[PDB]
Protein backbone atom coordinates (compact mmCIF):
# COMPACT_ATOMS: atom_id res chain seq x y z
CA UNK A 1 0.00 0.00 0.00
CA UNK A 2 2.72 2.56 1.10
CA UNK A 3 5.26 0.83 -1.27
CA UNK A 4 2.51 0.44 -4.04
CA UNK A 5 4.52 2.87 -6.30
CA UNK A 6 7.45 0.25 -6.37
CA UNK A 7 5.42 -2.54 -8.10
CA UNK A 8 7.51 -5.82 -7.89
CA UNK A 9 10.79 -3.77 -7.55
CA UNK A 10 13.93 -6.04 -7.23
CA UNK A 11 11.90 -9.32 -7.30
CA UNK A 12 13.43 -10.68 -10.56
CA UNK A 13 17.10 -9.94 -9.48
CA UNK A 14 16.49 -11.45 -5.96
CA UNK A 15 14.87 -14.66 -7.37
CA UNK A 16 17.17 -15.19 -10.38
CA UNK A 17 20.23 -13.00 -9.71
CA UNK A 18 22.83 -15.48 -11.03
CA UNK A 19 25.20 -15.26 -7.99
CA UNK A 20 25.95 -17.10 -4.75
CA UNK A 21 28.09 -16.28 -1.73
CA UNK A 22 31.65 -17.64 -2.00
CA UNK A 23 31.67 -19.42 1.45
CA UNK A 24 29.92 -22.32 -0.33
CA UNK A 25 29.09 -23.68 -3.75
CA UNK A 26 25.89 -24.61 -5.57
CA UNK A 27 25.04 -27.42 -8.04
CA UNK A 28 21.81 -27.84 -10.01
CA UNK A 29 21.27 -31.51 -10.88
CA UNK A 30 18.75 -33.29 -13.15
CA UNK A 31 15.87 -34.82 -11.17
CA UNK A 32 15.45 -37.96 -13.47
CA UNK A 33 17.96 -40.33 -11.69
CA UNK A 34 20.82 -39.38 -14.20
CA UNK A 35 22.39 -36.83 -11.70
CA UNK A 36 23.45 -34.76 -14.78
CA UNK A 37 24.90 -31.33 -13.82
CA UNK A 38 22.61 -28.57 -15.22
CA UNK A 39 24.44 -25.68 -13.45
CA UNK A 40 27.26 -25.05 -11.01
CA UNK A 41 28.74 -22.06 -9.22
CA UNK A 42 32.07 -21.11 -10.85
CA UNK A 43 33.82 -21.82 -7.49
CA UNK A 44 32.52 -25.43 -7.23
CA UNK A 45 35.69 -27.15 -8.61
CA UNK A 46 37.92 -24.98 -6.28
CA UNK A 47 35.81 -25.61 -3.14
CA UNK A 48 35.54 -29.39 -3.88
CA UNK A 49 39.36 -29.56 -4.62
CA UNK A 50 38.60 -30.82 -8.23
CA UNK A 51 40.78 -28.61 -10.57
CA UNK A 52 36.35 -33.76 -19.23
CA UNK A 53 36.56 -32.00 -15.82
CA UNK A 54 34.34 -33.56 -13.08
CA UNK A 55 32.58 -30.14 -12.66
CA UNK A 56 31.19 -29.65 -16.19
CA UNK A 57 27.71 -29.42 -17.73
CA UNK A 58 26.22 -32.90 -18.21
CA UNK A 59 28.70 -34.72 -15.93
CA UNK A 60 27.47 -37.11 -13.19
CA UNK A 61 27.12 -34.97 -10.00
CA UNK A 62 27.58 -38.18 -7.94
CA UNK A 63 31.24 -38.45 -9.13
CA UNK A 64 32.04 -35.16 -7.25
CA UNK A 65 31.44 -36.99 -3.95
CA UNK A 66 32.70 -40.11 -2.14
CA UNK A 67 30.97 -43.40 -3.13
CA UNK A 68 29.08 -43.51 0.30
CA UNK A 69 28.06 -39.84 -0.30
CA UNK A 70 26.64 -40.82 -3.74
CA UNK A 71 24.39 -43.40 -2.04
CA UNK A 72 23.06 -40.74 0.40
CA UNK A 73 22.39 -38.38 -2.55
CA UNK A 74 20.53 -41.18 -4.46
CA UNK A 75 18.39 -41.81 -1.39
CA UNK A 76 17.68 -38.08 -0.83
CA UNK A 77 16.71 -37.53 -4.48
CA UNK A 78 14.37 -40.56 -4.46
CA UNK A 79 12.78 -39.67 -1.04
CA UNK A 80 9.08 -38.62 -0.97
CA UNK A 81 10.08 -35.28 0.76
CA UNK A 82 13.64 -34.00 0.06
CA UNK A 83 13.63 -31.52 3.02
CA UNK A 84 13.43 -34.34 5.68
CA UNK A 85 17.04 -35.43 5.08
CA UNK A 86 18.62 -31.91 5.08
CA UNK A 87 21.42 -31.47 5.74
CA UNK A 88 23.38 -34.39 4.23
CA UNK A 89 26.88 -34.96 5.68
CA UNK A 90 28.92 -35.72 2.50
CA UNK A 91 32.57 -35.82 1.42
CA UNK A 92 34.25 -34.63 -1.82
CA UNK A 93 35.63 -37.61 -3.84
CA UNK A 94 39.39 -36.75 -4.06
CA UNK A 95 40.17 -34.66 -0.84
CA UNK A 96 37.39 -36.17 1.45
CA UNK A 97 36.51 -32.56 2.53
CA UNK A 98 33.25 -32.65 4.52
CA UNK A 99 30.22 -30.54 3.54
CA UNK A 100 26.73 -30.04 4.72
CA UNK A 101 24.55 -30.49 1.57
CA UNK A 102 21.15 -28.76 1.63
CA UNK A 103 18.83 -29.99 -1.15
CA UNK A 104 15.66 -28.45 -2.59
CA UNK A 105 13.63 -28.88 -5.81
CA UNK A 106 13.10 -26.13 -8.39
CA UNK A 107 11.49 -26.05 -11.93
CA UNK A 108 14.59 -27.56 -13.66
CA UNK A 109 15.73 -30.15 -11.03
CA UNK A 110 17.41 -30.30 -7.62
CA UNK A 111 19.65 -27.61 -6.21
CA UNK A 112 22.42 -28.76 -3.83
CA UNK A 113 23.98 -26.01 -1.64
CA UNK A 114 27.33 -27.20 -0.26
CA UNK A 115 28.59 -25.48 2.93
CA UNK A 116 32.06 -26.65 4.10
CA UNK A 117 31.86 -28.39 7.52
CA UNK A 118 34.32 -26.56 9.87
CA UNK A 119 35.00 -29.88 11.74
CA UNK A 120 35.95 -33.26 10.11
CA UNK A 121 35.35 -35.24 13.40
CA UNK A 122 31.86 -36.83 12.93
CA UNK A 123 31.20 -36.96 16.76
CA UNK A 124 31.90 -33.16 17.26
CA UNK A 125 29.61 -32.61 14.15
CA UNK A 126 26.84 -34.67 15.90
CA UNK A 127 27.65 -32.84 19.24
CA UNK A 128 27.06 -29.44 17.46
CA UNK A 129 23.80 -30.78 15.80
CA UNK A 130 22.47 -32.17 19.10
CA UNK A 131 23.40 -29.17 21.31
CA UNK A 132 21.60 -26.72 18.86
CA UNK A 133 18.30 -28.69 18.65
CA UNK A 134 18.27 -29.17 22.48
CA UNK A 135 19.08 -25.41 22.85
CA UNK A 136 16.07 -24.54 20.63
CA UNK A 137 13.74 -26.84 22.65
CA UNK A 138 15.14 -25.31 25.92
CA UNK A 139 14.65 -21.77 24.47
CA UNK A 140 11.08 -22.74 23.43
CA UNK A 141 10.20 -24.12 26.91
CA UNK A 142 11.69 -20.93 28.54
CA UNK A 143 9.31 -18.88 26.22
CA UNK A 144 6.39 -21.18 27.28
CA UNK A 145 7.31 -20.48 31.00
CA UNK A 146 6.75 -16.71 30.48
CA UNK A 147 4.11 -14.61 32.31
CA UNK A 148 1.47 -13.82 29.58
CA UNK A 149 0.39 -10.31 28.32
CA UNK A 150 4.03 -9.00 27.95
CA UNK A 151 5.08 -8.98 24.21
CA UNK A 152 8.11 -6.80 25.25
CA UNK A 153 9.38 -9.55 27.64
CA UNK A 154 8.75 -12.21 24.93
CA UNK A 155 10.93 -10.13 22.46
CA UNK A 156 13.66 -9.47 25.11
CA UNK A 157 13.82 -13.25 25.95
CA UNK A 158 13.95 -14.29 22.23
CA UNK A 159 16.93 -11.94 21.56
CA UNK A 160 18.90 -13.34 24.57
CA UNK A 161 18.21 -17.02 23.55
CA UNK A 162 19.01 -16.35 19.84
CA UNK A 163 22.23 -14.50 20.80
CA UNK A 164 23.32 -17.45 23.05
CA UNK A 165 22.37 -20.02 20.28
CA UNK A 166 23.98 -18.17 17.29
CA UNK A 167 26.85 -16.16 18.84
CA UNK A 168 26.15 -13.02 16.72
CA UNK A 169 27.51 -9.65 18.03
CA UNK A 170 24.01 -8.07 17.81
CA UNK A 171 20.53 -9.63 17.85
CA UNK A 172 17.46 -7.50 17.33
CA UNK A 173 13.76 -7.77 16.97
CA UNK A 174 12.60 -5.46 14.15
CA UNK A 175 8.81 -4.87 14.19
CA UNK A 176 6.94 -3.58 11.11
CA UNK A 177 4.58 -0.68 11.79
CA UNK A 178 1.21 -0.31 9.93
CA UNK A 179 2.98 2.10 7.42
CA UNK A 180 5.61 -0.73 6.77
CA UNK A 181 8.51 1.26 8.39
CA UNK A 182 10.19 -0.72 11.16
CA UNK A 183 11.49 -0.21 14.68
CA UNK A 184 14.12 -2.14 16.71
CA UNK A 185 11.96 -3.21 19.72
CA UNK A 186 14.50 -5.56 21.42
CA UNK A 187 18.28 -5.91 21.28
CA UNK A 188 20.99 -8.00 22.90
CA UNK A 189 24.47 -6.81 21.81
CA UNK A 190 28.19 -6.93 22.62
CA UNK A 191 28.60 -4.06 25.15
CA UNK A 192 31.20 -2.05 23.02
CA UNK A 193 28.59 -1.70 20.17
CA UNK A 194 26.31 1.37 19.81
CA UNK A 195 22.69 0.32 20.61
CA UNK A 196 20.09 0.36 17.78
CA UNK A 197 17.24 -0.22 20.27
CA UNK A 198 14.36 2.28 19.66
CA UNK A 199 15.66 3.32 16.17
CA UNK A 200 13.16 3.61 13.25
CA UNK A 201 13.98 2.80 9.62
CA UNK A 202 12.12 3.66 6.42
CA UNK A 203 9.78 1.11 4.77
CA UNK A 204 11.96 1.37 1.62
CA UNK A 205 14.99 -0.25 3.40
CA UNK A 206 13.12 -3.65 3.20
CA UNK A 207 11.24 -3.76 -0.10
CA UNK A 208 7.95 -5.69 -0.49
CA UNK A 209 9.84 -8.32 -2.59
CA UNK A 210 12.17 -9.10 0.36
CA UNK A 211 9.25 -9.15 2.87
CA UNK A 212 7.34 -11.52 0.53
CA UNK A 213 10.28 -13.97 0.18
CA UNK A 214 10.59 -14.26 4.01
CA UNK A 215 7.15 -16.01 3.95
CA UNK A 216 8.61 -19.02 2.00
CA UNK A 217 12.34 -18.68 2.97
CA UNK A 218 12.21 -17.95 6.69
CA UNK A 219 15.99 -17.82 7.49
CA UNK A 220 18.62 -16.00 5.39
CA UNK A 221 22.37 -15.93 6.17
CA UNK A 222 24.97 -13.57 4.61
CA UNK A 223 28.52 -14.61 5.60
CA UNK A 224 30.35 -11.42 4.44
CA UNK A 225 28.82 -8.32 2.86
CA UNK A 226 32.23 -7.53 1.17
CA UNK A 227 32.58 -10.98 -0.40
CA UNK A 228 32.68 -10.94 -4.19
CA UNK A 229 29.58 -12.81 -5.50
CA UNK A 230 30.21 -16.01 -7.52
CA UNK A 231 28.50 -16.53 -10.89
CA UNK A 232 26.51 -19.64 -11.89
CA UNK A 233 27.45 -21.52 -15.09
CA UNK A 234 24.30 -23.04 -16.62
CA UNK A 235 23.26 -25.38 -19.39
CA UNK A 236 22.58 -23.32 -22.56
CA UNK A 237 19.09 -24.96 -22.76
CA UNK A 238 17.96 -23.03 -19.61
CA UNK A 239 16.22 -19.86 -20.93
CA UNK A 240 16.44 -17.89 -17.65
CA UNK A 241 18.87 -17.61 -14.75
CA UNK A 242 18.60 -20.47 -12.18
CA UNK A 243 15.98 -19.89 -9.44
CA UNK A 244 18.22 -19.28 -6.30
CA UNK A 245 15.46 -17.93 -4.04
CA UNK A 246 15.53 -21.22 -2.04
CA UNK A 247 19.34 -21.51 -1.91
CA UNK A 248 21.10 -20.96 1.44
CA UNK A 249 23.97 -19.37 -0.59
CA UNK A 250 22.00 -16.80 -2.65
CA UNK A 251 24.16 -13.60 -2.89
CA UNK A 252 22.61 -10.42 -1.48
CA UNK A 253 21.26 -7.82 -3.92
CA UNK A 254 24.10 -5.28 -4.41
CA UNK A 255 21.98 -2.49 -2.82
CA UNK A 256 21.66 -4.57 0.40
CA UNK A 257 25.38 -5.63 0.33
CA UNK A 258 26.24 -1.88 0.27
CA UNK A 259 23.63 -1.17 3.01
CA UNK A 260 25.26 -3.81 5.26
CA UNK A 261 28.79 -2.42 4.51
CA UNK A 262 27.60 1.15 5.42
CA UNK A 263 26.02 -0.17 8.68
CA UNK A 264 29.18 -2.27 9.56
CA UNK A 265 27.08 -5.50 9.65
CA UNK A 266 29.76 -7.66 7.99
CA UNK A 267 27.60 -10.77 8.49
CA UNK A 268 23.91 -11.27 9.11
CA UNK A 269 21.34 -13.84 9.94
CA UNK A 270 17.76 -12.72 9.39
CA UNK A 271 14.71 -14.74 10.41
CA UNK A 272 11.01 -14.16 9.71
CA UNK A 273 8.54 -13.66 12.61
CA UNK A 274 5.31 -15.02 11.02
CA UNK A 275 1.83 -14.72 12.67
CA UNK A 276 -1.78 -15.44 11.50
CA UNK A 277 -3.65 -12.58 9.66
CA UNK A 278 -3.47 -16.71 6.37
CA UNK A 279 0.05 -15.55 7.57
CA UNK A 280 1.54 -12.02 8.14
CA UNK A 281 5.21 -10.98 8.48
CA UNK A 282 5.12 -9.18 11.87
CA UNK A 283 8.83 -8.59 11.99
CA UNK A 284 12.30 -10.00 11.74
CA UNK A 285 14.94 -11.26 14.10
CA UNK A 286 18.04 -9.56 12.70
CA UNK A 287 21.51 -10.80 13.73
CA UNK A 288 24.63 -8.82 12.83
CA UNK A 289 28.27 -9.67 13.32
CA UNK A 290 31.16 -7.15 12.96
CA UNK A 291 33.29 -9.91 11.31
CA UNK A 292 32.42 -12.71 8.80
CA UNK A 293 30.22 -15.44 10.28
CA UNK A 294 28.59 -18.54 8.78
CA UNK A 295 27.00 -20.81 11.41
CA UNK A 296 26.36 -24.48 10.47
CA UNK A 297 22.99 -25.43 8.94
CA UNK A 298 21.83 -27.44 12.04
CA UNK A 299 22.03 -24.23 14.18
CA UNK A 300 20.07 -22.29 11.52
CA UNK A 301 17.42 -25.04 11.50
CA UNK A 302 17.23 -24.86 15.36
CA UNK A 303 16.70 -21.05 14.98
CA UNK A 304 13.97 -21.65 12.36
CA UNK A 305 11.87 -23.84 14.71
CA UNK A 306 12.52 -21.46 17.67
CA UNK A 307 11.20 -18.71 15.35
CA UNK A 308 8.08 -20.87 14.53
CA UNK A 309 7.54 -21.19 18.34
CA UNK A 310 8.08 -17.41 18.82
CA UNK A 311 5.51 -16.65 16.02
CA UNK A 312 2.87 -18.94 17.64
CA UNK A 313 3.39 -17.51 21.18
CA UNK A 314 3.43 -13.94 19.73
CA UNK A 315 0.23 -14.68 17.73
CA UNK A 316 -1.47 -15.99 20.95
CA UNK A 317 -0.50 -12.79 22.99
CA UNK A 318 -1.73 -10.51 20.06
CA UNK A 319 -5.20 -12.18 19.59
CA UNK A 320 -5.18 -12.04 23.47
Please state the closest distance from residue 289 (CB atom) to ligand CYC, in A: 12
CB distance 286 to 76 below 8 Å:
no
Q: Contact with ligand CYC (CB under 6 A): which of 95, 119, 205, 276?
A: 205
Q: Contact with ligand CYC (CB under 6 A): which of 87, 98, 109, 207?
A: 207
CB distance 317 to 253 below 8 Å:
no
Residue 206 contacts ligand CYC per CB under 6 A: yes
- Nearest residue to ligand CYC by CB is 255
Residue 212 contacts ligand CYC per CB under 6 A: no
Burial 204-239 (b: 16+ CB within 10 A, else e): eebbbbbbebbeeebbbbbbbbebebbebbbbeeee
Q: Contact with ligand CYC (CB under 6 A): which of 186, 270, 302, 314?
A: 270
Peptide bond into 173 cis (omega under 30): no
Residue 69's Cβ-count burial label (10 Å; 0-12, 13-18, 19+) is: buried
Q: Contact with ligand CYC (CB under 6 A): which of 129, 184, 203, 314?
A: 184
Residues 46-85 that bind ligand CYC (CB under 6 A): none
Residue 135 contacts ligand CYC per CB under 6 A: no
Q: Contact with ligand CYC (CB under 6 A): which of 268, 271, 285, 303?
A: 268
State which residue, 14 or 275, has the beta carbon closest to ligand CYC.
14
The answer to whether 255 is annotated as binding is: yes
CA angle (309, 129, 138) in 5-degree steps: 35
Q: Contact with ligand CYC (CB under 6 A): which of 222, 227, 267, 287?
A: 222
Distances (CA, A) of 29 to 231, 239, 301: 17, 16, 24
Binding site for phytochromobilin, by residue number, is 255
Amino acid sequence: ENLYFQGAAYLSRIQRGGHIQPFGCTLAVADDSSFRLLAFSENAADLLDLSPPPVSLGADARLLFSPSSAVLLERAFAAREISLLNPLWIHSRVSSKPFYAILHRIDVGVVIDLEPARTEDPALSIAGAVQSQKLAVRAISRLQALPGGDIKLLCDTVVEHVRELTGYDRVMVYRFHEDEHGEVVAESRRDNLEPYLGLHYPATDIPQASRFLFRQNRVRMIADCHATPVRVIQDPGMSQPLCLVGSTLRAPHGCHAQYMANMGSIASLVMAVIISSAMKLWGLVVCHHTSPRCIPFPLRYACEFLMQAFGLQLNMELQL
